RNA sequence: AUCAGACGAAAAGGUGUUAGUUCAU
RNA sequence: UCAUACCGAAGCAGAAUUCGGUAAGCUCGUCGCAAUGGUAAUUCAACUUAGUACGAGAGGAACCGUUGAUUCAGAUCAUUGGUAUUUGCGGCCGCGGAGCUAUCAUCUGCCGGAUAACGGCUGAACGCCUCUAAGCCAGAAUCCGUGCCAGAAAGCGACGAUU
RNA sequence: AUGUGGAACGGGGUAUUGUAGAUUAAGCCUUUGUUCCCAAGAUUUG
């Protein structure tokens, strides 16, 4: 990382520049920009979407896509510096 | 440990019954040692016999 | 550090130990028949068990001591526990 | 900004949209951290599976304009839980991080630069503030309080790291103490 | 509990059934049937197919929850 | 073939499920029934909020792909007394009914029409002529017994099946005393039993049944485990498929009947997983041998919306009634 | 004997016995 | 017997764990009983627990729930993607309902004791002590039970009709 | 092996492909519809 709620290999929409309608994976900000399952934040919060919407991001923080649809997660943006460049607004 | 163990012993200490049990276990250790000498098997039996012979001599 | 809470049920037949070094699981020990366990008010955190069977009382004390056993902890450093203090004839 | 329990993550501000009268809370996570997030209507609802109100609700004491991407039914339940003066508006914008991209404080609504003027006005209308499109994580990077201190252990996301109420603020457990004091000075 | 409308077939979209697609422009498309999804994939014009209701025809504020409001909603 | 227990895998002879191990009973437990014969009405995905404290779907709407079982009422026309012996558990005597239905009489026979309908006729005479002999049999059962079961049979005519031999199988009358077991059996004699009374929609059910043969995979009697009930809908109930959230009236049967099964007009139950066997196959629903204490059984079930779309083909509407006004006026 | 017996690691060890002997008190 | 299940020992601060073993888990019927076998799962985790006992603190306790990742087996085609003799249909194609199939889908999947190692309590020999010689024990993915799978073609019982 | 008798079609429903039509259960449902046959034909059985 440059700074998994849903089932494994779930159909996750690549919100990043990959733009895949449903890419195999998931939790929002976990990479995975969004997911059907709620991402239980350590601060007691959740983060999810209607279905799995995990963007493409490498484990080292170098996200494959730099066009994250909507605002990327702030935890994801902090964990993945390219995800921060993918979407200026960090959720 | 060390300084911490000494400070704990001075402040709290240790169970006195454990020391009495340890002395009781020491007598059991001699009985266990005789049982162990009669329970060692295979290569351990030869090693135990060699250790016992060396200790006796 | 963490005080141990002792609860008596069925006229001392069942003894429940809670908050043992921060443990969140309560340990329940059932005394042998013919032995009654009560908390003496003369000495704080003192439990007195009286019965007609010496073997049953000794077995109950051993079970209580075995229940309150420190696991994966230093005996010299962590001295918290429950042990038999004194034993003798009631009369 | 008062440090609140947030476990490992220092972004308690993103989790809970603290406010004087619409202090939206965090749900579906750590019970102790969620209680600290609640501590001022505690809107602890996982709207659309997202309970990070401070990262998805652009507003303040007068009301929080949660993004329309979140579930309306859960938002309606959150609106019912929230006080009547607090209006839970729907932010139908591309930037789904209403709370994190828009620092819609009660006095001034620091909306996202990518958010349109109508979306900026929607956040401003909910919080009864003036719309101001600014960077595009204005809510995350800047505390929405009615000093640019790097909250969340020096992270550039100050508002996401430390929640800011209309008349107070709430930092995270691992948020920078100096930044939290700076946020307190900014929020008076 | 809201029933979505099909993007291609212009019909109700029940949960589970149908196919939901997300576009790169934050556009959500729902198909009532697999044929509608295939037609949408094939770039079929909704007005060019008489099966869809769109061709046949052309040829948000929340409120406080209350018992009376629920009764009014039930009547509507 | 990894599981050595099933090997050698051979097809089960009896299509009907066999309750090899009944749950343990006690006198404190009220007299009641565990196993209930049923049929695979079908299966349908239905949405439901997942109420489970500590879960990551806690109070979250999740679609539940589940299975619905046709469970017509249960008529009992016989009782068996099992006496424990050093060699094993032996049946002391069997007391069938004075009046047997045509369906259960069809079960005793291979054909109904060729025979002269002589099944249990002279027995029906001695039962009516001498009720005291039956009283002695019941008296013999009460004094010498530990296990009491009932010979209950299905009503095929209520079901939409070509089956006409009533499927019959022993069901232990769990609870109470042997005399109390017999008393309940005698009063419920020649009476139907509804599965809604047996299962409280929250109790623990391990469905057993025989699966579907494949051209020895198939016709295997396998006992499913951890399949909780969510709704025992009644056949006369038109609101069974319409819960509180989806108040729009609908029947569990998809329009045009279930897929390869037919229409449901009788009591049905609701459970998850997949049951051994395809649609319209005999299934047995019994109480769990072990008291499953996992939160999956403990959690209350508040079903959100039943689907009834045309699963056959591609059904875009769950009920015709709404689709009539939703879609334009038909040319007809 | 919790490997008897019955028909080489085998030397020995034994809180293992059986009979015990001898010597100390 | 690498890990793991079990514990014991070791500073093993806790985490991280190591080693030691234990441990091969990895007449015609109708309806029933179960002698005998195979085998209940199987491999491991994380969060909660507690973000704390320990620990200067940080990192991280037993137990609880949750998320699981599996293997294999059990299912079913509802969700799911196709295959598809509706080879059905519209223009050789464009595909395909049903049916079936899936680490291609959705899923479901054990038990209580005996004890092993292991440490005991009590109690002789050895007026005491003494896991032990009498006894009472604690303690295992092991074993046995248990559950499941069959059913003694040459097992059995109850019940029906009976040329 | 004389009646929800079944078996067949005539179908309806039905979705498919598909631009509404045809197949229309074939392992989709179902029939107040129709006819056919049959209160069987032999064998086995104390």
Swiss-Prot record, chain A:
Keywords in alphabetical order: Cytoplasm, Nucleus, Ribonucleoprotein, Ribosomal protein
GO molecular function: large ribosomal subunit rRNA binding; structural constituent of ribosome
CC per GO annotation: cytosolic large ribosomal subunit; nucleus; preribosome
First-listed, main subcellular location of the protein, grouped into a coarse class: cytoplasm
Cell compartments where the protein resides: Cytoplasm; Nucleus
SMART domains in alphabetical order: Ribosomal_L14
InterPro entries, A to Z: Ribosomal_uL14 (IPR000218), Ribosomal_uL14_CS (IPR019972), Ribosomal_uL14_sf (IPR036853)
Keyword Cell cycle: no
Keyword Cell division part of the UniProt annotation: no
Gene Ontology biological-process entries: cytoplasmic translation
One Pfam entry name: Ribosomal_L14
Family note: Belongs to the universal ribosomal protein uL14 family.
Function (record text): Component of the ribosome, a large ribonucleoprotein complex responsible for the synthesis of proteins in the cell. The small ribosomal subunit (SSU) binds messenger RNAs (mRNAs) and translates the encoded message by selecting cognate aminoacyl-transfer RNA (tRNA) molecules. The large subunit (LSU) contains the ribosomal catalytic site termed the peptidyl transferase center (PTC), which catalyzes the formation of peptide bonds, thereby polymerizing the amino acids delivered by tRNAs into a polypeptide chain.
PANTHER family (UniProt xref): 50S/60S RIBOSOMAL PROTEIN L14/L23 (PTHR11761), LARGE RIBOSOMAL SUBUNIT PROTEIN UL14 (PTHR11761:SF8)
Note: There are 2 genes for uL14 in S.pombe.
This protein's name: Large ribosomal subunit protein uL14A
Native source organism of the sequence: Schizosaccharomyces pombe (strain 972 / ATCC 24843)
Species classification: Eukaryota, Fungi, Dikarya, Ascomycota, Taphrinomycotina
From Swiss-Prot, chain B:
Compositional bias annotation for Basic residues: 11-26
Residues covered by region (Disordered): 1-32
Subcellular location per the Swiss-Prot or TrEMBL entry: Nucleus, Nucleolus
Intervals of motif Nuclear localization signal: 9-16
Function: Involved in the biogenesis of the 60S ribosomal subunit. May play a part in the quality control of pre-60S particles.
Quaternary structure and interacting proteins, as annotated: Component of the pre-66S ribosomal particle. Interacts with ppp1/nop7 and nop52/rrp1. Interacts with rsa4 (via WD repeats).
Family, similarity comment: Belongs to the eukaryotic ribosomal protein eS8 family. Ribosome biogenesis protein NSA2 subfamily.
Protein name, UniProt field: Ribosome biogenesis protein nsa2
Originating gene: nsa2
Residues of the full protein shown: 3 to 59 of 260
Curated annotation (Swiss-Prot), chain D:
GO biological process: assembly of large subunit precursor of preribosome; cytosolic ribosome assembly; maturation of 5.8S rRNA; maturation of LSU-rRNA; ribosomal subunit export from nucleus
Pfam families xrefs: eIF-6
SUPFAM superfamilies: Pentein
Main location: cytoplasm
Protein localization: Cytoplasm; Nucleus, Nucleolus
Cellular compartments per GO CC: cytosol; nucleolus; nucleus; preribosome
Residues spanning the membrane: none
InterPro entries: eIF6
A GO term, aspect molecular function: translation initiation factor activity
UniProt keyword terms in alphabetical order: Cytoplasm, Initiation factor, Nucleus, Phosphoprotein, Protein biosynthesis, Ribosome biogenesis
Protein's UniProt keywords contain Iron: no
Alphabetized SMART domains for the sequence: eIF6
NCBIfam families: eIF-6 (TIGR00323)
Subunit structure: Monomer. Associates with the 60S ribosomal subunit.
Stated family: Belongs to the eIF-6 family.
Job description of the protein: Binds to the 60S ribosomal subunit and prevents its association with the 40S ribosomal subunit to form the 80S initiation complex in the cytoplasm. Is also involved in ribosome biogenesis. Associates with pre-60S subunits in the nucleus and is involved in its nuclear export.
Protein name according to UniProt: Eukaryotic translation initiation factor 6
Native source organism of the sequence: Schizosaccharomyces pombe (strain 972 / ATCC 24843) (Fission yeast)
UniProt gene name: tif6
From Swiss-Prot, chain F:
Protein name: Large ribosomal subunit protein uL3A
Signal peptide: none
Annotated region described as Disordered, given as residue ranges: 1-24
Sites bearing Phosphoserine, chain numbering: 3, 55, 130, 133, 197, 242, 302
Function: Component of the ribosome, a large ribonucleoprotein complex responsible for the synthesis of proteins in the cell. The small ribosomal subunit (SSU) binds messenger RNAs (mRNAs) and translates the encoded message by selecting cognate aminoacyl-transfer RNA (tRNA) molecules. The large subunit (LSU) contains the ribosomal catalytic site termed the peptidyl transferase center (PTC), which catalyzes the formation of peptide bonds, thereby polymerizing the amino acids delivered by tRNAs into a polypeptide chain.
Family: Belongs to the universal ribosomal protein uL3 family.
UniProt source species: Schizosaccharomyces pombe (strain 972 / ATCC 24843) (Fission yeast)
Cross-referenced InterPro entries: L3_arc_euk (IPR045077), Ribosomal_L3_dom_3_arc_sf (IPR044892), Ribosomal_uL3 (IPR000597), Ribosomal_uL3_CS (IPR019926), Transl_B-barrel_sf (IPR009000)
Gene from which this protein is expressed: rpl301
Keyword Endoplasmic reticulum: no
Additional remark text: There are 2 genes for uL3 in S.pombe.
A GO CC annotation given for this chain: preribosome
GO biological process terms held by the UniProt record: cytoplasmic translation; translation
GO molecular function per UniProt: RNA binding; structural constituent of ribosome
This protein's record includes keyword Cytoplasm: yes
Location relative to the cell: Cytoplasm
Domain of life (superkingdom): Eukaryota
Organism ancestry: Eukaryota, Fungi, Dikarya, Ascomycota, Taphrinomycotina
């Amino acid at each position: 990382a440059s700074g998994l709620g849903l089932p494994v290999q779930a159909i996750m929409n690549c919100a990043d520049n990959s733009g895949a309608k449903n890419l195999y994976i998931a939790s929002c900000g976990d990479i995975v920009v969004r997911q059907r399952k709620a991402w239980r934040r350590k601060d007691g919060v959740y983060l999810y979407f209607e279905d799995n919407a995990g963007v493409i991001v490498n484990p080292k923080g170098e996200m494959k896509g730099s066009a994250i649809t909507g605002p990327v997660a702030k935890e994801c943006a902090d964990l993945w510096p390219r995800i921060a460049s993918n979407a200026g607004t960090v959720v | 440990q060390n300084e911490y163990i000494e400070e704990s012993i001075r402040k709290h200490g240790r169970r006195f019954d454990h020391e009495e049990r340890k002395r009781k276990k020491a007598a059991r250790e001699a009985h266990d040692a005789s049982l162990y000498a009669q329970k060692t098997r295979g290569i351990k039996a030869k090693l135990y016999q060699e250790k016992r012979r060396k200790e006796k001599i | 550090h963490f005080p141990i809470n002792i609860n008596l049920t069925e006229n001392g037949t069942v003894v429940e130990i809670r908050n043992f070094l921060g443990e969140r699981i309560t340990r329940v020990i059932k005394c042998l028949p013919g032995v009654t366990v009560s908390i003496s008010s003369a000495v704080k955190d003192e439990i007195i068990l009286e019965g007609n069977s010496l073997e049953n009382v000794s077995q109950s004390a051993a079970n209580i001591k075995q229940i309150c056993n420190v696991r994966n902890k230093d005996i010299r450093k962590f001295l918290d526990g429950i042990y038999v203090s004194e034993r003798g004839n009631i009369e | 900004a008062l440090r609140a329990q947030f476990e490992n993550s220092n972004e308690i501000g993103v989790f809970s949209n603290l406010t004087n009268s619409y202090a939206l809370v965090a749900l579906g996570g750590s019970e102790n951290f969620y209680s600290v997030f609640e501590a001022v209507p505690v809107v602890h609802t996982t709207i659309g599976g997202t309970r990070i109100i401070g990262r998805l609700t652009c507003g303040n004491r007068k009301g929080l304009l949660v993004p329309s991407s979140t579930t309306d039914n859960e938002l309606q339940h959150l609106r019912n839980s929230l006080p009547d003066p607090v209006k839970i508006q729907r932010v139908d914008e591309r930037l789904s991080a209403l709370g994190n991209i828009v620092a819609c404080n009660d006095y001034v609504a620091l909306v996202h630069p990518d958010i349109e003027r109508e979306t900026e006005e929607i956040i401003a209308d909910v919080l009864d503030v003036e719309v101001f499109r600014q960077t595009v994580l204005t809510g995350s990077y800047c505390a929405l309080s009615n000093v640019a201190g790097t909250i969340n252990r020096g992270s550039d996301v100050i508002g996401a790291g430390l929640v800011v109420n209309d008349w107070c603020a709430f930092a995270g457990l691992d948020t920078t103490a100096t930044e939290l004091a700076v946020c307190e000075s900014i929020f008076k | 509990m809201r029933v979505h409308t099909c993007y291609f077939c212009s019909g109700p979209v029940y949960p589970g059934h149908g196919i939901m697609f997300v576009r790169n422009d934050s556009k959500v498309f729902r198909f009532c049937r697999s044929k509608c999804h295939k037609n949408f994939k094939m770039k079929r014009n909704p007005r060019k197919v008489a099966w869809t209701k769109a061709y046949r025809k052309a040829h948000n504020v929340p409120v406080r929850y209350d018992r009376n409001v629920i009764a009014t909603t039930l009547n509507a | 073939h990894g599981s050595l227990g099933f090997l050698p895998r051979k097809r089960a002879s009896r299509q009907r499920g066999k309750v090899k191990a009944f749950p343990k009973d006690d006198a404190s437990k009220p007299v009641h029934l565990t196993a209930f014969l049923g049929y695979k009405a079908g299966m349908t995905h239905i949405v439901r909020d997942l109420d489970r404290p500590g879960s990551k779907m806690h109070k979250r709407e999740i679609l539940e792909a589940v299975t619905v079982i046709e469970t017509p009422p249960m008529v009992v026309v016989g009782v068996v007394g099992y006496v424990e012996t050093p060699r094993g558990l032996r049946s002391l005597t069997t007391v069938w009914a004075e009046h047997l239905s045509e369906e259960v009489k069809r079960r005793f026979y291979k054909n109904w029409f060729k025979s002269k309908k002589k099944a249990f006729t002279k027995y029906a005479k001695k039962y009516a002529e001498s009720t005291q002999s039956i009283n002695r049999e019941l008296e013999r059962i009460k004094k010498y017994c530990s296990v009491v079961r009932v010979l209950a049979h299905t009503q095929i005519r209520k079901t939409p099946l070509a089956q006409k031999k009533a499927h019959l199988m022993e069901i232990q009358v769990n609870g109470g005393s042997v005399a109390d077991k017999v008393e309940w059996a005698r009063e419920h004699f020649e009476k139907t039993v509804d599965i809604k009374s047996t299962f409280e929609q929250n109790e623990m059910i391990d469905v057993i049944g025989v699966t579907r043969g494949k051209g020895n995979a198939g016709y295997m009697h396998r006992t499913q485990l951890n399949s909780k009930i969510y709704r025992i809908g009644a056949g006369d109930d038109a609101k069974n498929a319409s819960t509180d959230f989806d108040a729009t009236e609908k029947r569990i049967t998809p329009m045009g009947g279930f897929v390869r099964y037919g229409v449901v007009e009788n009591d049905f139950v609701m459970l998850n997983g997949a049951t051994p066997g395809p649609v319209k196959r005999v299934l047995t629903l019994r109480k769990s041998l072990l008291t499953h204490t996992s939160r999956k059984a403990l959690e209350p079930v508040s079903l959100k919306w039943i689907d009834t779309a045309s699963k056959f083909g591609h059904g875009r509407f769950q009920t015709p009634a709404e689709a009539k006004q939703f879609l334009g006026t038909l040319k007809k």
